[PDB]
Amino acid sequence: VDVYGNPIRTQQLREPQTSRLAGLAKEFAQHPAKGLTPAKLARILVEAEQGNLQAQAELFMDMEERDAHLFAEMSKRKRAILGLDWAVEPPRNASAAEKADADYLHELLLDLEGLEDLLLDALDGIGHGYSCIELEWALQGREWMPLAFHHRPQSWFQLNPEDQNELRLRDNSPAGEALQPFGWIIHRPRARSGYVARSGLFRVLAWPYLFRHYATSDLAEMLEIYGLPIRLGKYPPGTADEEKATLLRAVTGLGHAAAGIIPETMAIDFQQAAQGSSDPFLAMMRQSEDAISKAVLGGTLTSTTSQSGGGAFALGQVHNEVRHDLLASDARQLAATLSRDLLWPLLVLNRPGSPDVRRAPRLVFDLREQADITSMAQSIPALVNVGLEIPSAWVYDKLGIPQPA
Amino acid sequence: VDVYGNPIRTQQLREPQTSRLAGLAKEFAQHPAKGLTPAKLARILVEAEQGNLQAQAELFMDMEERDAHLFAEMSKRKRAILGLDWAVEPPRNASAAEKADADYLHELLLDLEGLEDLLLDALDGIGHGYSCIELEWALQGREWMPLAFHHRPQSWFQLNPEDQNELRLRDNSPAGEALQPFGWIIHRPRARSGYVARSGLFRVLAWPYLFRHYATSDLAEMLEIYGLPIRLGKYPPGTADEEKATLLRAVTGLGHAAAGIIPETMAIDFQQAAQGSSDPFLAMMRQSEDAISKAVLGGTLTSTTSQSGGGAFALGQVHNEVRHDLLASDARQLAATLSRDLLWPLLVLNRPGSPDVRRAPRLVFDLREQADITSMAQSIPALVNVGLEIPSAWVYDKLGIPQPA
Amino acid sequence: FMADEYRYGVRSRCNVGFGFWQLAAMSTEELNQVNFEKVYDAMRNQKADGG
């Protein structure tokens, strides 16, 4: 069975759950970001709270695509995880059989193509609040294998009417369809405590995005109007339609044309077009960008930048507060999700027996922080000459150097 | 029994208390932050003081979601705790049986999945003033286990009419329902001395949030009006309705249109639209953000930033004042809550006998601060050559290096 | 602002209660047993099915 105890039947693993839903694969995103107003955004969020996640997912995708600063921040945050070395470790004080199981799982993950793509797809749940990856199960004789990992759009799911924390497929029915066991890797990182609909970071970031969009569009319009002044022509009674058209064309082309002549009975008045500055717009854009930077990566390095300054402890100063905390949180949550969803089916299908769930191997990301070799290498000799018996295992582990074999 | 002495009956542990309240699970948040005015906020707070916590909880959730700066600060503060290593220690001068009990509890917590989620859910009480997590109890033979931890919204509870410090479930009755023993982990951090309703940090942070919201909305409106000037057209007596509509459309499109012509008998006056600056709005936003930073994380590193500057003692300078105090306070309160709520039921159900409550093991968070290895390693040799017999236990404990085994 | 209730009273047994008192405490019995002792002895000797 799975970790949650639901019965597992190997018959349903031959075909993906969504195969019998050919309607989903033919859908196109509705792009709800175009022509978006604060009222529309509020309605979208409220409806999403009630189980209509399609519009929210499409809006989040558009928001990711249309904002360069937000996209850069999210990409940097995800690439931070994608570059971490990982390993599979056996449970606490594991036995020989458990060690062998962990070693086999580690070897299987090493030789499993598409792991990086799986991690990238799973990390989308950081912003979207939940990411679902469908599994393709195949048999190369007697051992089950994940053939491929398919990322399904968040717009394909909904909320259970009887449960606000349980996701279901959109199968044209009011209650949707329950997710098949062992058929998905659902990643639901928890930045804030609440239901799944409210758990996305883009829900926090939506309003600054709209503020920045409005400011940028208004600035573009004002830059378009800038330049020549608006000038209005006046004509006396008894001016025919042809003369009216001639005066109109003359006024229209007068800005580009340096000189022109009109009868003394006519008049042209040059009125202010748009006089001001870009200061308000740029102030709003800077405020929104700082808010986005703080919300995504913390207000110590991105928005209120940590500035330059090297040194042996500079790495620690830059990392440990804020950056290390965020990195560790994301890595630990991703590792927990993976150990729950991918490691367990492999252990319970590819190996004999029914090992207890509490003793399953856990995927661990390498969060080791580079320690100053020179300072500590200076420090050891004094301590050892004093008489302290420092274990070599601690040194080898903390320095990153492996133990002799 | 529990720590408070209330009789404990194992019959009620088979089902959650809220299972017989299927009405609660079908509710949706009312979103009281939309269209919020200072009078409405004052009424919400006053009503919450009197036992109506639903509106206050929903307002706090909206406040958390809609403010990026506040959300970033709270997330950083909580992630600070989530990254701390923890251990279970036996009581003062504990005996062999007590040491065995503590070791078994430590092993059980290590192998208990969902601990990080439990800590995150409990830390919500920092801002909300109280967090309730429901327990699922199951028997794997002869030993009780927490199957899962469920975080219930603060909107599901109320105040006892006869007691302002005791929370109760909303069961449609005036007096609510008392909380089941051993069925919840209630975390109520105490930033300020008072009743539970007034104990939330969001109660302090509400007013700066409203100030910032008003300033941002006003700035957005003023940016929308900025650009072209308002221009008013005037027409003489004897202008028909069709000519009036033509003049109105001409005036409406005149700002975008560089040129236009009107009869000499008409007139168009270009009046100031909105002339000023973003300085007042931005000043208010900065004031509110500084207030929020000071209230959440202290006015030494976040609002009045500590600036750069490394060194061996830089860690101490940044941490010990403000940051270390807040970290230690939060960690100690969380550890006390956990030791009270989760450790005790495990000890009194999973082990024989009736150990005295004063001798229960206590969960301890690792608050050890990194000490300068180089300076102290320089220092020891002089002291030891002088003749001082410094214990090795103090060195091993303070450096973080473990004693040889 | 409102409070809701879904209860109601009950009439448990009409053979274990008594009313309609001309209550007073003037004389030792001639006015005390008028009601207090009439209720007392009546209940002491109320009969059920089977005499």
Side-chain angles (χ1 to χ4, degrees), chain B residues 22 114 123 276-277 301 326 391:
Chain B
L123 288 162
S277 309
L301 179 53
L326 196 45

Side-chain angles (χ1 to χ4, degrees), chain A residues 337-387:
Chain A
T337 298
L338 289 174
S339 304
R340 214 186 305 113
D341 291 331
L342 190 45
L343 276 291
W344 183 246
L346 295 166
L347 188 75
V348 302
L349 287 163
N350 298 20
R351 283 300 191 87
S354 290
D356 193 3
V357 65
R358 185 72 189 182
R359 307 293 297 166
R362 282 171 319 286
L363 188 153
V364 176
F365 277 101
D366 200 350
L367 275 292
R368 182 257 178 184
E369 184 170 357
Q370 184 272 328
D372 309 284
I373 297 95
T374 312
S375 68
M376 198 269 307
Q378 284 152 293
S379 67
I380 284 158
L383 300 170
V384 299
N385 296 115
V386 161

Side-chain angles (χ1 to χ4, degrees), chain A residues 175-198:
Chain A
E177 173 159 354
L179 276 73
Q180 183 178 2
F182 278 22
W184 303 85
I185 302 190
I186 315 295
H187 188 45
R188 289 148 61 156
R190 295 258 301 290
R192 271 90 168 171
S193 175
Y195 285 130
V196 65
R198 299 270 277 280

Side-chain angles (χ1 to χ4, degrees), chain A residues 47-85:
Chain A
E47 275 180 342
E49 274 184 61
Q50 293 179 356
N52 187 80
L53 306 179
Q54 189 192 309
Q56 183 178 265
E58 278 152 347
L59 171 66
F60 289 178
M61 288 166 210
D62 291 331
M63 185 180 288
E64 182 65 26
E65 183 178 1
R66 292 152 70 87
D67 206 292
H69 186 67
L70 184 147
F71 162 81
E73 307 274 323
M74 292 301 315
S75 66
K76 176 194 311 169
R77 195 181 160 170
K78 288 189 278 190
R79 280 192 277 93
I81 301 296
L82 294 175
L84 285 178
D85 262 6

